[PDB]
Write a protein that holds these residues in place. Structure first.
Motif, PDB file in Angstrom:
ATOM      1  N   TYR A  96       0.948  -1.075  -0.094  1.00 33.90           N
ATOM      2  CA  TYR A  96       0.055   0.012  -0.069  1.00 33.90           C
ATOM      3  C   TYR A  96       0.725   1.190   0.000  1.00 33.90           C
ATOM      4  N   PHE A  97       2.147   1.308   0.437  1.00 36.61           N
ATOM      5  CA  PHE A  97       2.885   2.494   0.619  1.00 36.61           C
ATOM      6  C   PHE A  97       3.456   2.767  -0.819  1.00 36.61           C
ATOM      7  N   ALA A  98       3.470   1.981  -1.789  1.00 36.20           N
ATOM      8  CA  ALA A  98       3.875   2.175  -3.217  1.00 36.20           C
ATOM      9  C   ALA A  98       3.260   3.225  -3.799  1.00 36.20           C
ATOM     10  N   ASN A 132       4.093   4.912   7.778  1.00 35.44           N
ATOM     11  CA  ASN A 132       5.221   4.130   7.261  1.00 35.44           C
ATOM     12  C   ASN A 132       6.550   4.838   7.602  1.00 35.44           C
ATOM     13  N   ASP A 133       6.329   6.249   7.687  1.00 35.36           N
ATOM     14  CA  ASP A 133       7.537   7.106   8.145  1.00 35.36           C
ATOM     15  C   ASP A 133       7.355   8.284   8.622  1.00 35.36           C
TER      16      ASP A 133
END
Lengths: 49, 49, 50, 49, 49
Positions: A29-31, E44-45
């Motif tokens: 999902y983070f792409a 995520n970050d």
């Protein structure tokens, strides 16, 4: 409100359940949407062989 | 832990407690280990070896 | 013609992030009833029968 | 015979009757299973073994 | 989704685990509603904001 491996209560925190509680796998999902080439968005595409 | 029922822990407990109750009766009757005051005698009381 | 009653809410209801086998908190709402009563507005005007 | 009950809203003393430590099975998220059986024993002469 | 249970039979602690104050709902003619939901979150970050 108890420790993991408490002597009287069974919990999913407890070490005895290791490997029975495996997560489901999912898509990355983070792409971002995949990077197409920007020159091909502004230059003219032509038939070629 | 009830929602997941890992390794059928809840079904397995209901089998293990029944065996614990059978073992409790045998140990109370043979060796008198934790016997209730209502049980009259146990075999380890014999004066013969 | 009897009017209206409105139960205006004023309470800070609350909830907490909680682990497996942790104790849940207890909470309560709050209210204040407000009421509306109608009023007349009226006028008369007069002319000769002719 | 051997008998089972299940509950999600009783209250249990995790300590002893002389030194209580109560837990609500409803205010913590818990479920309990209770198992019970009943036996009688007589040995007429323990010196016969 | 968001879930609700109701009881007239439970006992609740109105204090905390360090200083209990129990009330029986059934002996006081009270009723209680338990509200529950369950969520997951990942960033995520955290250095991206």
């Amino acid at each position: 409100g108890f420790s993991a491996d408490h002597s009287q209560i069974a919990q999913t925190k407890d070490t005895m359940f290791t490997g029975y509680l495996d997560p489901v796998q999912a898509k990355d999902y983070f792409a971002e949407a995949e990077k197409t080439s920007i020159v091909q968005r502004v230059a003219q595409k032509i038939p070629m062989g | 832990t009830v929602r997941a029922n890992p390794a059928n822990y809840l079904g397995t407990m209901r089998t293990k407690v029944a065996t614990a109750i059978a073992m409790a009766f045998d140990n109370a009757a043979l060796h008198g280990t934790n016997a209730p005051s209502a049980f009259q005698g146990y075999l380890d009381q014999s004066n013969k070896t | 013609a009897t009017g209206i009653v409105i139960p205006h809410w004023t309470g800070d209801v609350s909830a907490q992030w909680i682990g497996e086998g942790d104790m849940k908190p207890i909470t309560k709402g709050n209210m204040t009833k407000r009421d509306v009563h109608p009023a007349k507005i009226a006028t008369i005007f007069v002319a000769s029968a002719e | 015979g051997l008998s089972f009950d299940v509950t999600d809203q009783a209250t249990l003393n995790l300590g002893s009757q002389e030194s209580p430590n109560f837990v609500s099975l409803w205010q913590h998220n818990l479920v309990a299973v209770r198992v019970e059986a009943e036996y009688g024993l007589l040995i007429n002469d323990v010196n016969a073994f």
